[PDB]
Design a protein around this nucleic acid. Structure first.
Ligand SMILES: [Mg+2]
Ligand SMILES: [Zn+2]
Ligand SMILES: [Zn+2]
Lengths: 378, 59, 95, 189
DNA sequence: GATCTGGCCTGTCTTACACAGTGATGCAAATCAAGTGTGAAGCCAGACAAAAACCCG
DNA sequence: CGGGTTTTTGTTAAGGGCTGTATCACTGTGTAAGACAGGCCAGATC
DNA sequence: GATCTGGCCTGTCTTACACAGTGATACAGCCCTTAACAAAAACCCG
DNA sequence: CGGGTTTTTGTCTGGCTTCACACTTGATTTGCATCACTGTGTAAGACAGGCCAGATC
């Protein structure tokens, strides 16, 4: 309900005085349950030592700078960043979903004294926020932009005997209610230096725990967990920026295949997914070393677009609204072309196409009774 | 499709309006504890336990 | 506590589902309770006739301009004035 | 400061109030008929509004007292001996005299005869003051009194502004060193 | 007689300043964790007789 | 294995009272889209 | 050979358009009183 | 106006349950005041354009 503490205490004491008995609970037990539910409360362990990661398990929010010296004689930086510990937030999410996964296991013809190794599919995502500053002193002061890095659990499975059984499947993972956040930064999305400096420890811990075994207590029985991470909650801009590709410019535009715009326009269905992460690393190494001594454009075409060093392995995907609007735009364009009898006209003028679009919009507003607009949407 | 089996329908203001609400309603000054508080509240808001206790009116 | 209608209904239904009993009140009961306190509800009278004042006794919020002359051929004005009636407000305060 | 719209909005309320001034309400709140009278007192008006809705000039008039007709020059000579010589009816009379001008006198003499009344009053106000303004005025006067007594001006007929600023700085430093107080031109309570 | 110049008047930003908020602490104080152990109340079974108000002869 | 006997729910009649969501005029407000001013050329001309 | 110009990129920069939140209104589901029939079940003796 | 009819009011004897001090002390939470730290509406406060009259070749 987005309630503060003073007014909550006021309502609490008012209800306690009116009803006589105590029905609500004061801020003491509330904060107690809060700090109990927050990450970094219950113990856990890992069979591998988890190198480069401490073994302390009673810490929560920490500075996102990761001990970055920001004194006068260093690189200027003032973006305040806060973060959780990846393992801590992960075990906290697992603990708060323990009840749901136990209910699912009981429903799926399974007992309670079961051991792992459970398999948890965890997806990661991060995106900016835009203006988050309500400046009212003198008006628009600064376009302060923020960013959040988060994760989400959407699949929990267990393999017993021969086959497996999905004891937990998220009903709607594309929602704003199961987006467990890791870190928050007051940095621009275009600021590559600060973003990389803040996201490097998270990626380090991720790569460290990618091949580990979690051991946790749920109901008095030790349970073993393994995790499979998937980067698929990034838009095409962030994928193209992080994976070392160029901007939205030159002919190299596909993120799943190494084709070009001209090759795609010539051969439409003649491509398959080939852009991996190790391939991009090798292409960047070739770009940096240039073991053939070729011209700029020669090696640029040889590396096929990539010109920067990627640092986050991602699994690209595609959105439904985008794949629908990309086809609707071409349908609208081919309709505009076909309502002008262009197969007979050798040339095409701007006034001709303008009048054709005007006639099309007029007929549409007359028949279907809608409002045409050049701003294409979904 | 063969890799995942679901193209999905993920899409906005849900990341900015909620953040500004948490920052304006319950947060501190000095830009030091403000982020800690908003992160704690955002973590508490997406808890399956709290949501399960909330939506219990359907059954 | 500066509570909106939607959030109050959410809290009400949540408490009713987690407790079983209806400890709080629904929205229509709250609307009746707030209408029973707004001006222009309880009857009253005046010993003098109070000329230039209407005798209707079930009016609340009214336009503060009191029959303005907002036509285009008149002095321009861009204001939004909302007011209670003086006798109605006094009767409400007394009740 | 928008006078015409404020008057157009507040005229019905003033009419209702002046019509209710001499009425008798009858209610049935306690199960039995109860009669009610009313006495209105408009004392919740600040200086900026009581110098505008009453007809007097806003801030440029020599007349400063909202109760007496003493000018600024006569106020510095006569300190305590005064009386309240202002009301709504006399203000209406003075405005009518200003508008008619039956004596056919100059503008300055007519202005000092109407005691600064230029606009027509339409709200019977009862002005009042608070302790905050009184104490801040007394302290602002005593500050300059301390400056004048520490500068030794009773023996120096004409001093300089820079010398007075030096006096002010010395007094501020002495006060901050002994009493440990932070001086500031922006004065408050 | 024709401009030139110092001193008020007044609508201007301009700028400091106390207050309201958010959150968390942090000591003084009322209450409770169990141990009996009485000890004073509340109602019920057994069948037999006193105040107070309204209608009828 | 299957009826007998017994112990619990549904059904539509209807104008009500009561309670839970869905919507409706209202604006505000975040956000990619696609246009446009330059930047940077390679070709035509004196 | 030096200078002017049309065309391809490129980094902003305004926008319309899809939503977001709110108090009041409007639909839209649950009990009520006879009741003779319509069903579900648990347990038991044949 | 006096008497009758309810209606409420009590009775002891013997017999059930049922909450409360009484310390016992020493943790627990309960509550109100205090702490850290800024954003902002508001009132003091100069401030220069404008309006003047006093003045010199
Ligand atoms: Mg994005
Ligand atoms: Zn492709
Ligand atoms: Zn005076």
């Amino acid at each position: 309900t987005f309630l503060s503490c003073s007014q909550y205490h006021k309502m609490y004491r008012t209800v306690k005085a009116i009803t006589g008995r105590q029905i609500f609970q004061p801020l003491h037990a509330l904060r107690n349950a809060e700090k109990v539910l927050l990450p970094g409360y219950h113990p856990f362990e890992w069979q591998p030592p988890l190198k480069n990661v401490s073994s302390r398990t009673d810490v929560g929010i920490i500075d996102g700078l990761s001990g970055l010296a920001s004194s006068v004689d260093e690189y200027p930086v003032d973006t305040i960043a806060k973060r959780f510990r990846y393992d801590s937030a992960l075990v906290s999410a697992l603990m708060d979903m323990e009840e749901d996964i136990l209910e699912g296991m009981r429903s799926q013809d399974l007992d309670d004294y079961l051991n792992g190794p459970f398999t948890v599919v965890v997806k990661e995502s991060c995106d900016g926020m835009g203006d988050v500053s309500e400046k009212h002193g003198s008006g628009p002061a600064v376009p302060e932009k923020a960013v959040r890095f988060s994760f989400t659990v959407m699949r929990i499975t267990i393999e017993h005997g021969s086959q497996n059984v999905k004891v937990f499947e998220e009903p709607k993972p594309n929602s704003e209610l199961c987006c467990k956040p890791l870190c928050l930064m007051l940095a621009d999305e275009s600021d590559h230096e600060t973003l990389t400096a803040i996201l490097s420890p998270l990626i380090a811990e991720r790569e460290a725990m990618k091949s580990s075994e979690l051991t946790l207590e749920m109901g008095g029985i030790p349970r073993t967990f393994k995790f499979i991470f998937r980067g698929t909650g990034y838009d095409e801009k962030l994928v193209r920026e992080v994976e070392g590709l160029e901007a939205s410019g030159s002919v190299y535009i596909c993120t799943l295949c190494d084709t070009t715009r001209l090759e795609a326009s010539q051969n439409l269905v003649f491509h398959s997914i080939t852009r991996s992460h190790a391939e991009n690393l090798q292409r960047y190494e070739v770009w940096r070393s240039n073991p053939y001594h070729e011209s700029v454009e020669e090696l640029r075409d040889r590396v096929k677009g990539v010109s920067a060093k990627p640092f986050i392995e991602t699994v690209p995907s595609i959105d439904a609204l985008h794949c629908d609007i990309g086809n609707a735009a071409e349908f609208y364009k081919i309709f505009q072309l076909e309502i002008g009898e262009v197969y007979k006209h050798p040339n095409a003028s701007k006034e001709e196409r303008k009048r054709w679009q005007a006639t099309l919009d007029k007929h549409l507003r007359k028949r279907m009774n809608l409002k045409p607009i050049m701003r294409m949407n979904g | 499709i063969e890799r995942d089996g679901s193209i999905g329908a993920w899409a906005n203001q849900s990341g900015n309006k909620l953040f500004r609400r948490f920052r304006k309603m319950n947060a501190r000054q000095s830009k030091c504890y403000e982020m800690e508080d908003v992160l704690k509240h955002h973590w508490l808001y997406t808890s399956k336990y709290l949501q399960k206790f909330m939506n219990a009116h359907n059954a």
